[PDB]
């Protein structure tokens, strides 16, 4: 009757991994946004394409897939699964 | 028994995060590949070492770890297991 303990341990370990993967991607995209802005600022100092940088910049900040708020659902689903 | 239902919901939920994680990375690489091109373009606009960006660029576009059909393979496995 230890299947629930095995499943809960595996699912608890798995759910932790998704959260860690999410954090690194969010941390990277923040660096990329800062990375691009500093590049564009230097490009303007050299003297157009800044409209292109604005559009791709908004796409980075305007994601909708919502990688969070559903990992929380996954952690929830395990919780009432264990009490069985 | 309900154990099939609980396993099915948890695995269906988990597959969603895997697809969402992969898409965010692919969007990131395209920005990084594009951003390096602008950085490389700006360097030549300043005026000899047009290398180690191409080879890195080849490496970025030439990954061979899939993450397109392996997730699809996982989804097929879950659906097969749900029929038990």
């Amino acid at each position, epitope marked *: 009757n230890d299947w629930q303990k095995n499943s809960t341990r595996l699912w608890n370990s798995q759910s932790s991994i998704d959260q860690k993967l999410a954090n690194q991607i969010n941390d990277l995209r923040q660096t990329v946004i800062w990375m691009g802005d500093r590049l564009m600022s230097l490009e303007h100092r050299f003297q157009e*394409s800044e409209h*292109h940088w604005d*559009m*791709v910049r*908004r*796409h*980075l900040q*305007g*994601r*909708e*897939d*919502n990688l969070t708020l559903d990992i929380s659902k996954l952690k929830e689903q395990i919780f009432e699964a264990s009490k069985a | 028994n309900d154990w099939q239902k609980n396993s099915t919901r948890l695995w269906n939920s988990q597959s*969603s995060i895997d*697809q*969402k994680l992969a*898409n965010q990375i*692919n*969007d990131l690489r*395209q*920005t990084v590949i*594009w951003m390096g*091109d602008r950085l490389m373009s700006l360097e030549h606009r300043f005026q000899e070492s047009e290398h180690h960006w191409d080879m890195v660029r080849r490496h970025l*576009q030439g990954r061979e770890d899939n993450l397109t059909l392996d997730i699809s393979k996982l989804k097929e496995q879950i659906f097969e297991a749900s029929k038990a």
Partner: antibody, heavy 119, light 107 residues
Framework: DVQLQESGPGLVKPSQSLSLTCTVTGYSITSDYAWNWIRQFPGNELEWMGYISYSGSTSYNPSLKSRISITRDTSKNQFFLQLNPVTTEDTATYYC????????????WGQGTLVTVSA | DIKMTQSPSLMSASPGEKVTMTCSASSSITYMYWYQQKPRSSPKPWIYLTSNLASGVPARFSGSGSGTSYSLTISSMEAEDAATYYCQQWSSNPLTFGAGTKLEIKR
């Protein structure tokens, strides 16, 4: 002021190659952005075919990978579409488009040319 | 692929009214766009990232929605706004368009 101007044969026989050009005016197709091909079936539903980026890397629709081929001519600022096998189901209105790399935002379009497939 | 159901397929209205369009996705998407197509013309860029308005789009137009359901709304419809509206998503290869909601005008 980018202005896409596409052209091609208006009538192709079944099981024959389709070649379309897309002249670009006011911009260089190597400088930046992606360049897409889109078609509209007679029922007025759009389908995205593929694109070729500014550097030359191309992506194609998974349902047409064995068929579609996109090539560009840098010197005269044109990119071409090739579809060797065809069928009467390819009767549509094909379009050009320039889109941002990160997303799919076709901020510019061609005038629109009609290709009908019948013998 | 993702199926972008668009409802209603064919509506009607009179000038000055309130109109809404729904475009519900089959699964989770990443980006949302809206296009306008008048007869015998290429689609025009109308709305990007489901909130922003393209250049030269009347302020009456507005976009909203999150998750899988999205909406396009005109505060006060004018006669020039009668055209088919297409919703497009970009999550993975390939992008998918909507069936198209063809607004009309009551005389």
């Amino acid at each position: 002021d980018v202005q896409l101007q596409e052209s091609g044969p208006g009538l192709v026989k079944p099981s024959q190659s389709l070649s379309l050009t897309c002249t670009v005016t006011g911009y260089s197709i190597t400088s930046d952005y992606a360049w897409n091909w889109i078609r509209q079936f007679p029922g007025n539903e759009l389908e995205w075919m593929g694109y070729i980026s500014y550097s030359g890397s191309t992506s194609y629709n998974p349902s047409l990978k064995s068929r579609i081929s996109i090539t560009r001519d840098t010197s005269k600022n044109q990119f071409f579409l090739q579809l060797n096998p065809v069928t009467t189901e390819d009767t549509a209105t094909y379009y050009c488009a320039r889109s941002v790399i990160l997303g799919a935002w076709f901020a510019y379009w061609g005038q629109g040319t009609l290709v009908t497939v019948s013998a | 692929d993702i199926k972008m159901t668009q409802s209603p397929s064919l509506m009607s209205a009179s000038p000055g009214e309130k109109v809404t369009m729904t475009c519900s996705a089959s699964s989770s998407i990443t980006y949302m766009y809206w296009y306008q197509q008048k007869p015998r013309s290429s689609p025009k860029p109308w709305i990007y990232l489901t909130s922003n308005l393209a250049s030269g789009v009347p302020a009456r137009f507005s976009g909203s929605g999150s998750g899988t359901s999205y909406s396009l709304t005109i505060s006060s419809m004018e006669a020039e706004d009668a055209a088919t509206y297409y919703c497009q998503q970009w999550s993975s290869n390939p992008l998918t368009f909507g069936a198209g909601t063809k607004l009309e005008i009551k005389r």
